UniProtKB/Swiss-Prot annotation:
Domain remark from Swiss-Prot or TrEMBL: The 2 chromodomains are involved in the binding to the histone H3 methyllysine at position 4 (H3K4me3).
Full protein segment contained here: 1007 to 1266 of 1468
Family: Belongs to the SNF2/RAD54 helicase family.
Function: ATP-dependent chromatin-remodeling factor which functions as substrate recognition component of the transcription regulatory histone acetylation (HAT) complexes SAGA and SLIK. It recognizes H3K4me. SAGA is involved in RNA polymerase II-dependent transcriptional regulation of approximately 10% of yeast genes. At the promoters, SAGA is required for recruitment of the basal transcription machinery.
Covalent cross-link (Glycyl lysine isopeptide (Lys-Gly) (interchain with G-Cter in ubiquitin)), residues: 138
Miscellaneous remark of the record: Present with 1620 molecules/cell in log phase SD medium.
The name this protein goes by in its record: Chromo domain-containing protein 1
Compartments, as annotated in UniProt: Nucleus
Gene disruption: observed consequences: Decreased sensitivity to the cytotoxic effects of 6-azauracil.
Domain of life: Eukaryota
Subunit structure: Component of the 1.8 MDa SAGA complex, which consists of at least of TRA1, CHD1, SPT7, TAF5, ADA3, SGF73, SPT20/ADA5, SPT8, TAF12, TAF6, HFI1/ADA1, UBP8, GCN5, ADA2, SPT3, SGF29, TAF10, TAF9, SGF11 and SUS1. TAF5, TAF6, TAF9, TAF19, TAF12 and ADA1 seem to be present in 2 copies. SAGA is built of 5 distinct domains with specialized functions. Domain I (containing TRA1) probably represents the activator interaction surface.
Species in which this protein is naturally found: Saccharomyces cerevisiae (strain ATCC 204508 / S288c)
Amino acid sequence: MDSIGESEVRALYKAILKFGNLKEILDELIADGTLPVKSFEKYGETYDEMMEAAKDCVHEEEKNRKEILEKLEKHATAYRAKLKSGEIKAENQPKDNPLTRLSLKKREKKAVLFNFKGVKSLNAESLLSRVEDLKYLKNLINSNYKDDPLKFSLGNNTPKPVQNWSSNWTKEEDEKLLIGVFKYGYGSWTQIRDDPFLGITDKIFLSKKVPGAIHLGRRVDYLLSFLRG
DNA sequence: GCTGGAAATTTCCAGCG
DNA sequence: CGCTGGAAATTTCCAGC
């Protein structure tokens, strides 16, 4: 009757990518069919368990990348030594060599996934970074403009402008966008566009246009990592 | 199977020597 | 010119129906 299965998990995970830490507002979510009806406490324990599992997954993948880079580094060293000593000619080189290998691995980014309670391919990175980002944003707008989130501003921070977007997109639009993420959650691009108080209806697009959903996500992540440092 | 969204891959582009 | 890093576009992948 109260146990947890897979539907409640998927719904939760999605809700976490949407609102980060949501234990504050579980009720409201249950109260609008966002989450299946279950107890506040049990959802709390499931959330804690999920974030725990994400922490552990990221940890294990970090260990893995570490060891792989150790080995690749060793190979790089032993290769340099041979180039200098002259046992390898520099111009008769294959394009696949310990150097290019160590480099590509150095700069490789890839999904960090895990399974949880019979739900498959959850993104630990997305979960953690989303909780942090949305916490930083909530605290950022509440500590200053609580009685009117719309008056939020970046101050004298000037984030680098957008590249070849189809709408005249300025700092103002960044502010409004962030306010919208604070209001409806990460991903709710339709509600953000349609809110007339934000007044950015004719600057979002869901010859293909720009910016769409993905582009909004990138812009939000960049804006927040920028405002931090 | 099908399909939407995520993930991976490719392409585009600006900044630089 | 080519290199390189970042963003956009394009293709592929996969879980859940």
